[PDB]
Each structure stands twice: as structure tokens, then as C-alpha cells.
Amino acid sequence: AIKKYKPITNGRRNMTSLDFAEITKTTPEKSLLKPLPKKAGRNNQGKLTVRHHGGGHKRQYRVIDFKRNKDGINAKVDSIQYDPNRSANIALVVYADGEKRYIIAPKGLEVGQIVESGAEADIKVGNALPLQNIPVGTVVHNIELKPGKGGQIARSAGASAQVLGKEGKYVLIRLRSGEVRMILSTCRATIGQVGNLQHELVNVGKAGRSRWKGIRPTVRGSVMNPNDHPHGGGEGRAPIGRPSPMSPWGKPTLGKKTRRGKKSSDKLIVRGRKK
Amino acid sequence: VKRTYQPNKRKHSKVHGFRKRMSTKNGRKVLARRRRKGRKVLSA
RNA sequence: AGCUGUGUUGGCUUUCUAACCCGCACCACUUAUCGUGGUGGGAGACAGUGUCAGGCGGGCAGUUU
RNA sequence: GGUCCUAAGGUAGCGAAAUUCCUUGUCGGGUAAGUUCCGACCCGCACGAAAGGCGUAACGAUUUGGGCACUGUCUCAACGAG
RNA sequence: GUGAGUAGCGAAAGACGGGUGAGAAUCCCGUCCACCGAUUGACUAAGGUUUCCAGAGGAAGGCUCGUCCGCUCUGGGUUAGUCGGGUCCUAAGCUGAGGCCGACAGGCGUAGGCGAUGGAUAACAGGUUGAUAUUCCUGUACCACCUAUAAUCGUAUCGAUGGGGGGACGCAGUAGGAUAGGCGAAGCGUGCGAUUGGAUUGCACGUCUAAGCAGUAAGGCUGAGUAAUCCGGUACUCGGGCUGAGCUGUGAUGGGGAGAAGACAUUGUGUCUUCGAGUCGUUGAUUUCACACUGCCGAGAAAAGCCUCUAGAUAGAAAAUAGGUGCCCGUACCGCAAACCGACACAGGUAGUCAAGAUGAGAAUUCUAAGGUGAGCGAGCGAACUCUCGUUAAGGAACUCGGCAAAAUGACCCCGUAACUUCGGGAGAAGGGGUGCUCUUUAGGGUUAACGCCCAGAAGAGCCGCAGUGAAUAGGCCCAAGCGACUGUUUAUCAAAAACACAGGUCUCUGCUAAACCGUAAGGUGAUGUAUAGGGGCUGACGCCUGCCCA
RNA sequence: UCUACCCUUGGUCAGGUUGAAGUUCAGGUAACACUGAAUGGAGGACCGAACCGACUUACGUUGAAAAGUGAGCGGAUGAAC
RNA sequence: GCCGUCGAAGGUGGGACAAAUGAUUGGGGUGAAGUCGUAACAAGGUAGCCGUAUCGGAAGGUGCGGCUGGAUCACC
Ligand SMILES: [Mg+2]
Ligand SMILES: [Mg+2]
Ligand SMILES: [Mg+2]
Ligand SMILES: [Mg+2]
Ligand SMILES: [Mg+2]
Ligand SMILES: [Mg+2]
Ligand SMILES: [Mg+2]
Ligand SMILES: [Mg+2]
Ligand SMILES: [Mg+2]
């Protein structure tokens, strides 16, 4: 779980780490790594879009198979490694063709697993097979959205989904945010819940390791004089004085919905969100 | 104190040089006014 | 007040595919995850877009006090 | 307890405070002597619960009052060197 | 012009003898004296572009003078197959054939190119000039290519723009192996004293490179036929060299350096020159030479040279010997500065390599070495007043907006230490004691066969001064409140905070061609991330909590 | 080319000091298993130079310098330069 | 007569325990019940009581568990 710390310093007063007991073979595989230069919000004009980014520690992207091809070949699981680009851990499967690849690792996985559409396809944790071939009440993750595209929905650490039922051409999926939604019946799904479940209790504990992860400070609005934030200065501290708290570009940020009338999402979203 | 001209042979040519004038279009209007006024040195 | 059923007008829906659309899959130009060409699979006369019209709009401008 | 009215019409906790005009509030401690300081009272001109309320070990080239130590800052100045 | 022959003369130790000259406190030569010495010393980048050097100059420039010069006239100075780049490779970025967008101009982008601050990459000692030296010439080398060649092996070979390995990587700590420099005692050369005394007693030095043969203290993994290849995957029964490696040993080397003898010239012109012998042993030993090894989480660039593999091309080349060829650009000079950026010969700023002795944990402090400099105005008199320092009777904040400035505390080794708390802290809490030199005994490592050498701690005895970290360098402390939790960051140049950040709490928005933002659009950021994840609003660790009102 | 964040590739920090997790041995455990002694070398940790800053004060103010020098002062293995 | 070991009292400093005292301050018993309500003992008129929370001027009221030391007809 989480290994705690003892308050020898005011920095390490309440800091709490995440114990690396589910990591085997800590060195990577030197044929599936691709370089990853950073950018802090610097698009193809050099300007600054999205704020609060940049710096920290160098990384190196690790090529992940989200497609789950190579039908009907038994894949062992060798070693469970660490991945900095994302919240889950990672796996190193070996297909019997000697084609070593990476899989995002579900909850308990060391044994050896199968990808096949409908042969028997062996519904267990780690096996990917399309949603027409999955019985109901079955916790899946890493679903595709468009057929043959690649697994998109629910890829986090400790995330999941749930197949509810089967409609006339689609299936019916309950997502992690609590939003029932129709997905086409030939999208794949890994069966299981993705591992590394103790992730959101990692108390960072210090403004320095919240700072070498690629985060910069975020100055509040009411301390900017009114050239650049609609919560401008005033003498002393001040209540906001608007009918609605505003983002730094005029739009009200506290309450107003933002999505627009969109193609192939109104006829599919049955229930909305629950928050 | 550290003054505001720290000289360099490369940034002086990669910015104000001849082939950075002729690069764009408005550089060829700068070079059209310095060989019009009658300057000796067109591009630094 | 309300029945019946033809000649003509304006809708609400429901389904099919021929435009159009895909930051959807292999395939060629090519030992380029750009592009165009090609059988699919999706969505489909809605969306994107042109002209007109109404409503919010200190996000921004011109000025009065 | 009566009664007017408001959409209900200041709860726990703090209180002459970075918040108190009059005010140098008042009684206690500190000094030979204390408009500043510390502990209390509460009649809050006008504290108050995420423009957070009340406490707090550790940390400060922070701000305010009192002790020992040391001294030309001082009573009171004099001499010498570049 | 007046201000006026006034303010200045830009940190800083000079004194004299000799020359030179029309002219000298200032130029050159000599002796003594002082100053830096983790630098005021020695090499290279950036930048400047002849300043460098010899012979002649004295109108201007130099804060004075000048015979002098970084200033004027004449004539000279920079040598590479091996050093730093280019003919080799790729990061961020830039540019982009077709293409996609836009009133025109033009913006974006795929294949391909450009781009070192990085990867690859064959030479080292000594001599010499008035100015250049891994460049010139002395002695030994090495990599690429070409030509003759013999022992020749022959489907033996050459292998891609293509498959594979490889190159290939963070911060932290500790124990090692070897070497560099250091210090002492005993290889050799010269001197042995006219200030009391002394004659194993006084100063100086203790050599050598790259190549190519050897054997090494440690560090890292254990071995076979089958499913664009016999290689790299995969899976199977059976089962002690492999690479990489600082350092050392001979040879390189009958050679070359050397503190000095001794043999030659006019001012020995302050010099060449011919031959001339030493180079042991002991210790203390790094920040140099591995990201090696163990641990930790924040998970630590790419492509080439190089090695194999086949598609293919061909059947022609090992070793060894001998001769031959190898291009372009930068080299002078200053380079923590009188030569660079500050208008100046300006008390500022300017990346990196080398860095010794004494005392010391130490690259701190005081005094010196190698090696440089004496700061381009001086001479007098020692009034007031300003500026930088030193000491003081009795009293000790009475001074004052205020203990503002100064004074005291300061090192190591010991005894001893409260409230309070998040149990880590408070704490160097506070308040206290001891230290010098000489002589006698004994217990402590490592080195070594051992005398020998360095590292140390105990008691006891004794001596001297006013004073024993005797000089320089090095915390004042305590009680009680206020604001902010902390380390951090802010108004280059009147404000460093109680303001900003912060770890944590919430609230709301986003189902993926996501919301949000930049851009008229194409394209991008968000992200090669997907509700334990992203954008925004307020509060600001931790503890106990957050009350009623929806007109 | 100054400064403000920022991307790719490098470099630099004398020394000395406390002693977090763990691991091993011993003591009890066989119940609910926790005390000591060694070893290990953690941290926006403490004292201090280079190095980076600019708190108090005196001088300077037709300055030596259109922002500086003298004595002291804070950070110094990182949110560093 | 001088030197040294041991040595009461004194002076210096941080603590440890009781006691005397102190602006205000919180409950407690005492009376005499004037002030405000009836919470128990009858089924005391909402059956009581023990733990444990949360609210109110005042006894106290409600929630979730246990007890009969719970009338009627003892709640068949
Ligand atoms: Mg306006
Ligand atoms: Mg030294
Ligand atoms: Mg020094
Ligand atoms: Mg103290
Ligand atoms: Mg204290
Ligand atoms: Mg778009
Ligand atoms: Mg500075
Ligand atoms: Mg600053
Ligand atoms: Mg019971």
C-alpha cells in the first residue's frame, strides 16, 4: 500500500509515498522506447496556450499496444514494469511469435493470456474480445470507441466500466463517471479492473515534488490588478463583486455548461452525469 | 552591473545579416532604401 | 356542436441510401502515422457551409458625464 | 410576556483587538514614575465562521513591550594615527 | 569671458649608486626594501583586428614630467595527413518538392535537407628566434589510400539505402586497487665561515614521452536443433573463457635533460662552446583515473562510425618487404584586462583547466615558494573642520522616534541541561570548568623480516609569566505577546513584508475530433493523456469545527 | 545579445556534523510478538568557503561608478546556480 | 614562618515540593422560596429508567440499542 514517512523535517511532515512492491525487472526493454521532448503549452506558433506546465524530469515514451491484434496466440506475462507517462503500471507480454509487447496491467496478472474474437476467448482478467461476445454484468476496461481504432475509454489507474445489456445494434456501457452510453457491438474490451489502486492517497507533502512532475504555480485571480483578470484589485482584500465568478477570459466558470450540439452523441447518451 | 551589448559574431549575422534580409519580403524593402539613399554598407 | 370522406396548404415523427461528412480499418502512389486515389465499416438528408433575421455580448472598441 | 415588521432578522467561539469615534474605558500586574505592553470585565460607534472562526510545537535579515551581559550612545569631553 | 590660478589629479612603499641626455623624483642597469600568493601567478574559449617585435621620433594623446610608450614614420611578424573546426552523424529549432488553407502579401506541413553547446575521430618528447611552435628540425611512431609483389588460396572473398545486436546515458552514498604531487633519511656536486661558540654541519637535486611486446586489482554474464535468412527473437532434453581493465616490467634510450666541474672571447658584450659522473630507500597519499557497485523515485536524448545476417554481385585477395601520395579555414598579440562590454589608460561585470610549504577537519586564517608587480602627480607643515581607525578615570541606556552604531559572546575537549509539544523537536538551551613549555614510566592501529617511520590518547612530577585557541579567523543570551505554518519568491535603480506561491480542503465544467485557450482558416497545445485523468473559481499544513435565510 | 518565463545539449558546490527507513544478531515470543545493541546513510535537514543574493548602517550624490566600495548579513544537495 | 591535600560559612546559577496570597471566574451546598414553567410517583395524562449522541431560557425533548425496577384484560 502506502509507505508513510516520519516527520524528521517540516517538509516530510505529512508526505506519503506509494510502495513499489508490484514492480518486477526495473530496467526497460531497449527496443520499444521512443523519445519524448517536452513543451509547456508551446504550440506551433511558440506562444502559450494551456497554463501551468513545464520542467521537472526527463521522460521517455514507452510504446503501448492498445489495438490487441494477434488473434488466437497465447501470450505469457513476463515482467511488470513502471511507466511514468500514465497512472497505471505496465506489462511485458510475449506472444509465442517472439513479438514482445506492452499491455496496461489489470489487477492481478502474472499467468498467461489470450486475445481472440470469438474462438472461445477465455473470459478472465487480461483477455480482450468484442462486446457482442461478453456476457452481462462483466467489469471491463480499455474499451474501444470506433471499431478497429484503439482502446480509449477507461484507461486510468483503478478505473473500470460495466456492461449492462444489449440493444438492437449497440451494447450499453456504464462508465466510471456514471454515464450510461451506447457503444458499437464490435469494439473490443479488456476484461478486468486496471491495477495500481492505491494511487489517489499519495500525499505529495511538499511543494517541490509537486513541482518536478511538470507543474508550475497557479496565482489566484483576486490578487491581479484589473488589466488581466476580471477579479481585479480594489483596496484591501475584496469579495468578487460579480454575479458569477469568471475565468480569466470572461466566461462564467462556476455552473454554466459548456458542450455543444454534437454529432453522434445525443442519440447515444441516455443518462447524464451524476455530480 | 552587466551592460546591454554582449557581442557575438554569429547572432549578429544570423539576425541582421544579408541572407536574413533577403529571406523575407520586408527585408528586400529595407535593402531597397539603403542602396537608394546611397549608403556604403547595406547589411551589418 | 359534431360526425364521414375527397380535390389543395402547413407541420410532427418513422425508416431506407444516391449526395455530403469521418483527427474510421488494411491497400497503392512511396522502404513518408501529410496528402490524393481505391473495396469496405460508421453516421446519414441532420451536421458543416452561403445569404437573411431575431436574442444574449464591458470579452473589446469609440465618446459623454 | 405583549407587539410592529423582514425572505430568516448573528449560533459556537473570540472581545478597547493590524478591527473601539468619545477613550489616556475600567479594576489587577510591571516602574521611584507607564497615552505604548501583559491578564481579565463586555455597554461590540462598526468581530464572526472557506473575501474562513478559534488554538498551535517548529521556522523568521518580520513587528511590539521587559530583563541580565557589555560598552564614549550619555552626564562631559580630552589625546594620539593615516 | 566671470566663477579662478579655485575644486581636482581616479585605493596602494619606496630609497640610493651609476650611466644617458640640450634637458631626469618619472626612461634603462645594479643592490637593498616592501605587496599578492584559491592569486595581482601559469595555459586556453568569447570578443577585439596589428596592439605583437627591432631600428629612428617628441607637435598632438598620457589628468604632472618624459630621452619613455598600448601614440607618430620606416622595415618585419602568424608554417599542421595526427591539435580546434569542414570533406562523417543527429537534438531544440529553422527551411521545405508535391500537398492543405488565405482580399493580394502570405501562414502551416509530409519525404528530403541544414544545425554543436553532444556521439565518432590516426603524435609524442627535447632543441631553437629579435617576434611563431604537438606547425620549423632532431630521434622514434601511427591511420587512410595507391603501386609493385612473393608463401598464395580459390563456391576464398565484397557485402545495401534493408532486417538485428551495439553505441545508450539520472541524482545520492560508502568501502576499496593504483598512480600524481608532498615530507624525511644516507648515493652526487661546492663551502666549511673573522659577531661569543660549534666542524655529521650548511644550502641545493634525486631524470625520461607516445607507440609494441608482455601479465593485472578488481567489475560483468556460463552456452544445443528445431518455427529475409545459418543472425535476433521464441521453446526445449543434456549442461572449467568470455569480453572489458586503471597500473606496472623490459625495450623506446650507447640516445635526450640535469643542481655543477672545467675548458674559450674585445665592456669575461650581461655569452656560445669542446669533452664531463649521481639519479636509492622509507613513509603519508587526492576533489585524478568507473555511474563501477549497493540504495532510492522524480524512472533518467536521438542517428552514425563499429559487429554480424542474408537479397545480391562476383570466382582476386591474408601476412610480410619496398618505394609513393594526403587537400580547405583559424594560429601574432591582450584574454578577472592600459588591448573585451561600461563615452575614458573607469575602485564595476566577464564560462572553464592547473593551484605547492608551514599551522589546520579545509580550496578558512596568518607568513612565504614557483612566479609577478611597486599602481603615471610629487615635495613640505604636522591649525580648525570633514573622512577611516586606536585607547580612557567614576557611572553604565541617564542618550534617543528606537540600545541606531560600537563593546562583549566566538575554536576544540568535558560535566550538565527547563517549560513545552505534532514525540522527530526544544538545544550550541541555559549556566559551567580545563588548554603553555620540559622530563620520566605504561597500555593503543597500519606499514615492515626487523632497527626505522607516520597516527595518537592516560596519570604522575616540575618550571615560568599580569595573561598559556597568549597574534589573525569563528554564535551574545533569556521571559512574554502579535501575524503568517514551513524552505522558497516579489517592486533591475527610495518598499523584502503580515503581500505572492505552497502541501492539503472543497466547489463546478468536461464520454474524446473532450471542455479550455492561441490562430480570420489550415493546423496545433490539452496528450502521442482518456473521470484515481485534464481546464477554471475561492480558502491556504495540522488540530476542533463551519450556524439560520432561495423574497 | 539586457531582463521575463521556456525548450535541446553540457559544467560546477572546500570541508565538518547529526543518524530516518530498513537489514542482521541477541532477548523474549508460538499470546496480541515488541524492547536493546550493531550496521545502513535518509532529508526543499544544522554550522561554513567558492558561488549566487542585497537586510541594517556609515561614506559617496558638478561620484572612482546614470545604482557603487568599507564593516557586518541570508541561502549554500536544491522550488540551486 | 612559608608550600600542598581535606575542610564550616559565604557568594553565583538553574531547577524540584508544599504553603501564604491575587483582578476576575466556574460549579456546589445552605433559605425564604417572591420571580418563570410541570419533568417524575395513578397509564402522572407522550409509560419510566440505564448507556450514548445532538439541540433548548427552565426542568428536559428526540434518535438508535438493552431492561421490567411496564397499568389496562398484565400489552392473546
Ligand atoms: Mg470603456
Ligand atoms: Mg596549501
Ligand atoms: Mg587566503
Ligand atoms: Mg539560544
Ligand atoms: Mg526557548
Ligand atoms: Mg480546430
Ligand atoms: Mg548582484
Ligand atoms: Mg532579485
Ligand atoms: Mg443483555
Author numbering:
A (entry chain L2): 2 to 276
B (entry chain LG): 2 to 45
The authors write:
Ribosomes are the cellular nanomachines responsible for protein synthesis. It inhibits bacterial protein synthesis by binding in the peptidyl transferase center (PTC), the active site of the large 50S ribosomal subunit. Using a rapid workflow for cryo-EM data acquisition and data processing, single-particle reconstructions enabled determination of 70S ribosome structures from the Lins and Linr strains of S. aureus.
We examined a linezolid-resistant (Linr) clinical isolate of MRSA from an Australian hospital by single-particle cryo-electron microscopy (cryo-EM). Genome sequencing of the Linr strain revealed that linezolid resistance was due not to the presence of the cfr gene or to any mutation in the rRNA genes but to the presence of a single amino acid deletion (ΔS145) in ribosomal protein (rProtein) uL3. The deletion of Ser145 induced a contraction of the rProtein loop, while most interactions with helix 90 in the 23S rRNA were retained. Comparing the Linr and Lins structures revealed a large shift in G2505 into the binding site of linezolid. This shift was mediated by the change in orientation of G2581 in helix 90 due to the change in uL3. The rRNA bases undergoing the largest shifts are U2504, G2505, U2506, G2576, and U2584, all of which either are within or surround the PTC. Data for the Linr ribosome were collected on an FEI Titan Krios EM operating at 300-kV acceleration voltage at defocus values similar to those employed with the Lins sample and using the same electron detector.
